[PDB]
Design a protein around this ligand. Structure first.
Ligand SMILES: NC(=O)C1=CN([C@@H]2O[C@H](COP(=O)(O)OP(=O)(O)OC[C@H]3O[C@@H](n4cnc5c(N)ncnc54)[C@H](O)[C@@H]3O)[C@@H](O)[C@H]2O)C=CC1
Lengths: 313, 138, 103
């Protein structure tokens, strides 16, 4: 009876959130005034890194001044590629140092590695769907220039901001009281992880190999100690690094800024109500699921949370 | 109730301290990245210490060398340049205006005006060309 | 209007401005800078945006409609130019910022 009640209020809360997403556009998530930072593709990768760090961002649309076209987004992945190229080609330090953003495609070719957008006026639910299935944590908001008839970046919408927008407007999240363990939305199987002595380069390899935002760092006995995020790669490359390539992840983590907000953990008995509370109060990108004693059992990311909201169990 | 925590060993101060206690040599060598996010001072357009006709002269020379065209100004609007720049509409329109801040201090205001046979980046890129041309000719 | 690449004589020939001075008010000198385009206002407009995303204070800074589509600049840093324009998107306002190198 009490578990049947918990279950119906959850459905009630989910159906309400869903209706909110179907009733709002991506444009509605936009602040009334905001900044869009765009980088000309002839800018040095080196300098574009400083731009991102100065302005507390991790992504920026790219603009080709020769063709008057947008040319995709700069993300941590691009910097992974540069690191991987350099590690494999340590002789090419000069090329890497003078690498321009439009030279990024040649780096990709040398490595042999292979973008969703949405019209702002479209339903926010639809923006959530497209972002999920593009396997990206971001979606550029693109419209058409009324004069030139050209594709224009209006903004970049992130999973975090969407979930925060939901959380802020919809206090019904409080009634999502089913433990996440009973919801079958945590990834438990085939956790890609490493240890403190694992070379950072191999962890970076794991990032692109698994197509994941972070690698959990455990000890011999499976206790979660820390995490390596793709975001950390920016810090790693900052100021040009060469001796600090074959470094261990533990060593590389000392580059982390003192205002690093930390890694979030939870257990299977935590509720999405609490999870949304945290998203609402702080920029949290995932919750690593541990057991009673702090051993890693799994992870609950923003994409998992959003997938549940849209699709269910 | 809530078992949502921040992992203490994930925090820089504890991670460092554990690495130092483990004896790691890189613990003392590696310092945390301190990104000095310095607030940039923003201004509309560019300022100039030269005088009106001199400044207006400089601007037109830049415009001409950059391949732009402009209207013939009347007496009432001498310090206004209604220009057109080659770069589906083909020609970008700009309105440049000279303002006075002080007797020796002037501001060159640039305004996007449209297209002739929305995104500000074509406009921003062109003003970039213009600003750079003006800096050389000084 | 008719468009041409001929620089107005007033800026190339001293005779033209001389005639104006001599032939018997405000139009002989450039107009004063409008209060809206003052850099103290532009940056408190920047500080209120930063105050909302880092501290959460008050409401977001609506720009004055006067400044829309006007070029914003800053000092050249690391051979990189940083220009911006505050533009309209529906009922929202986008400060479109561009970083370009000096080549
Ligand atoms: N290079 C690429 O293609 C990359 C793609 N992405 C994608 O971005 C989207 C959203 O990202 P986020 O919300 O940050 O989620 P995420 O990037 O952490 O998502 C990865 C998926 O696998 C799970 N996961 C996360 N870390 C894992 C690990 N270390 N080992 C095993 N499974 C792990 C998550 O629960 C999630 O279902 C995801 O679809 C993710 O795949 C993220 C990084 C790189």
């Amino acid at each position: 009876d009490s578990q049947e009640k918990v279950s119906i209020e959850q459905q009630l809360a989910v159906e309400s959130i869903r209706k909110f997403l179907n009733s709002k556009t991506s444009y509605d998530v936009l602040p009334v005034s905001y900044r869009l930072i765009v980088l000309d593709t002839s800018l040095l990768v080196k300098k574009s890194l400083n731009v991102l760090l100065q302005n507390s961002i991790v992504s920026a649309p790219l603009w080709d001044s020769k063709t008057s076209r947008f040319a995709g987004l700069l993300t941590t992945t691009d910097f992974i590629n540069v690191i991987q190229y350099y590690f494999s080609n340590p002789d090419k330090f000069e090329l890497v140092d003078k690498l321009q953003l439009d030279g990024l495609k040649d780096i990709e070719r040398a490595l042999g590695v292979d973008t969703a957008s949405i019209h702002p006026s479209r339903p926010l639910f639809e923006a959530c769907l497209k972002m999920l299935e593009s396997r990206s944590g971001r979606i550029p908001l693109i419209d058409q220039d009324e004069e030139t008839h050209r594709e224009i970046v209006v903004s970049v919408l992130t999973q975090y901001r969407i979930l925060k927008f939901v959380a802020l407007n919809c206090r019904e999240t409080h009634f999502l009281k089913i433990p996440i363990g009973d919801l079958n939305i945590i990834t438990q199987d085939n956790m890609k992880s490493c240890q403190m002595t694992t070379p950072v380069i191999d962890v970076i390899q794991m990032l692109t190999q698994g197509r994941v935002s972070s690698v959990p760092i455990i000890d011999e006995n499976g206790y979660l100690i820390n995490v390596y995020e793709a975001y950390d790669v920016l810090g790693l490359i900052k100021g040009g690094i060469y001796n600090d390539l074959s470094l261990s992840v533990g060593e590389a983590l000392m580059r982390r800024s003192d205002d690093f907000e930390g890694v979030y953990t939870c257990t299977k008995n935590d509720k999405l109500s609490t999870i949304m509370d945290n998203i609402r109060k702080a920029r949290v990108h995932r919750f690593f699921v541990v057991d009673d004693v702090g051993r890693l059992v799994g992870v609950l990311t923003l994409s998992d949370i959003l997938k549940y909201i849209l699709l269910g169990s | 109730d809530s078992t949502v925590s921040i992992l203490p060993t994930s925090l820089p101060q504890i991670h460092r301290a554990n690495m130092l206690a483990q004896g790691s040599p890189a613990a003392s060598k590696i310092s945390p990245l301190v990104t000095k996010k310095s607030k940039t001072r923003w201004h509309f357009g560019i300022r100039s210490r030269s005088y009106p006709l001199d400044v207006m002269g400089e601007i037109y020379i830049a415009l001409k060398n950059l391949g732009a065209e402009w209207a013939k100004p009347s007496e009432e609007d001498l310090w206004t340049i209604k220009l057109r720049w080659k770069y589906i509409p083909d020609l970008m329109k700009m309105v440049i205006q000279l303002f006075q801040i002080e007797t020796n201090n002037y501001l060159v205001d640039f305004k996007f005006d449209g297209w002739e046979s929305f995104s500000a980046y074509p406009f921003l890129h062109l003003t970039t060309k213009l600003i750079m041309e003006l800096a050389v000719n000084s | 209007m008719e468009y041409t690449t001929d620089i107005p004589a007033v800026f190339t020939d001293p005779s033209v401005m001389e005639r104006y001075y001599y032939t018997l008010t405000s139009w002989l000198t450039p107009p004063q800078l409008p209060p809206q385009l003052e850099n103290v206002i532009l940056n408190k407009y920047y500080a209120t945006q930063d105050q909302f995303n880092e501290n959460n204070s008050g409401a977001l800074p609506i720009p004055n409609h006067v400044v829309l589509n006007h070029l914003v600049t800053s000092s050249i840093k690391h051979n990189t130019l940083c220009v911006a324009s505050i533009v309209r998107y529906k009922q929202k306002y986008v400060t479109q910022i561009l970083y370009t190198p000096i080549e």
